[PDB]
Amino acid sequence: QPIVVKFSHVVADNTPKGQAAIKFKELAEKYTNGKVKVEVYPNSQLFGDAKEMEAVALGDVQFIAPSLSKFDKFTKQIQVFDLPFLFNDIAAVDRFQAGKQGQALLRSMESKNFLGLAYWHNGMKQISANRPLLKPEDAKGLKFRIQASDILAAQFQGLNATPQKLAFSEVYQALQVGTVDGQENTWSNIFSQKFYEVQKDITESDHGVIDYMVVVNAKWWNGLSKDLQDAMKKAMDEATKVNNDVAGKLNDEAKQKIASSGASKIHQLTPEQRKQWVEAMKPVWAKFESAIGKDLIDAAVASNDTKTN
């Protein structure tokens, strides 16, 4: 009777998270000599956004890797990752995650019996709708789908737009029948879930990030025999390295496919347009500073590094 272990997520197989979870499966089975069988369930086939945390708590799923925007019901510290324009680029996000404060966040939910094993990457968020979004004013009066995050809701409220919380699996349909006008996501997600086919203008804003925390039930994980836990720990580290190697290329490749399709128009901001977007979104920070903790915010800010000039 081999031990069945299930890994659930909401994205497609051909994605930074999807490819990493498949690597994890392959390696955990190898390193346990077949004693463990990993079943991977992509595209919300087993659980989606709304239920995966509960599934982990009850033992219906062993591994998940939610966006870092989806934890504000469990802690008020991880929501630091949602502050718009906090990180200039993916390199700053990774430096922050690797430092003391970023690594501390993996343990931020231990009192609720959740444990983060690793961070996985996706990429930078782009914004889209059915009209060009070149300046923040263009967003006024539009409905935007958002992940279930208080800071993302405030971010759109601040643009005098209307956020709407929806589960990832429901976004395409919402955009397709017009119950929402726009959204923010990474190129990888925008291509693989076909948002580009129902959004005619996408702006390369790079105004936030979608990255992930690999989460387990702490009690379950810590109760495993030393030999099984080491095997799976080895598999996880190696899957995390695949994720770090493929995330960038997969997003670049997605962007190109969207562009080549002709179905959407990709817009590039200029310095003055971008600077405007920054000003229009920064007040959100002051609203959440006390809840997050200024020091954590300052450490994130400091993770940015710009070459001279």
Binding-site entries for succinate: 17, 70, 145, 185, 189, 212
Taking CB under 5 A as the criterion, the residue among 16, 28, 49, 281 binding Cl ion is: 49
Residues 6+ apart with CB under 8 A from 42: 9, 10, 11, 12, 13, 18, 21
Contacts of residue 226, Cβ cutoff 8 Å, sequence gap at least 6: none
CB of 10 or CB of 202, closer to Cl ion: 10
**Which structure tokens are listed for 174?**
């919402």
| Contacting range for Cl ion; rule: CB under 5 A; set: 4-12, 65-73, 131-139, 301-309 | 4-12
Known binding-site residue numbers: 17, 70, 145, 185, 189, 212
Q: Which CB sits closer to Cl ion, 167 or 242?
A: 167
* Choices 10-18, 32-40, 63-71, 154-162; region in contact with Cl ion by CB under 5 A: 10-18
As measured in angstroms, the least distance from the Cβ of 77 to Cl ion is 16
Nearer to Cl ion, 94 or 181 (CB): 94
Options 26, 48, 131, 266; binder of Cl ion; rule CB under 5 A? 48
Report the alpha-carbon distance of residue 123 to residue 211 in Å, rounded: 7
Which residue, 235 or 284, has its beta carbon nearer to Cl ion?
Answer: 235
Residue among 113 and 169 whose Cβ is closer to Cl ion: 169
Do the beta carbons of residue 147 and residue 189 sit within 8 Å? no
Q: Does 44 bind Cl ion (CB under 5 A)?
A: yes
Q: By CB under 5 A, tell whether 119 contacts Cl ion.
A: yes
Produce one character per residue of 50-71: b if its CB has 16 or more CB atoms within 10 Å, e if not: ebbbebbeeeebbbbbbbbbbb
DSSP three-state, residue 14: coil
Q: Examine residue 10 and tell whether it contacts Cl ion (CB under 5 A).
A: yes
Q: Is 307 helix (H, G, I), strand (E, B) or coil?
A: coil
* CB closer to Cl ion, 71 vs 288: 71
Rounded CA separation 285/30 (Å): 45
Residue nearest to Cl ion (CB): 48
Residues touching Cl ion, count (CB under 5 A)? 9
Does 266 participate in binding Cl ion (rule CB under 5 A)?
Answer: no
Contacts with Cl ion, 151-170, as mask; x by CB under 5 A: ----------------xxx-
- In the chain, alpha helices (H): 16-31, 52-58, 90-98, 100-105, 150-158, 171-177, 187-192, 218-222, 226-261, 271-281, 283-292, 294-302
Residues forming the site for Cl ion (CB under 5 A): 10, 44, 48-49, 118-119, 167-169
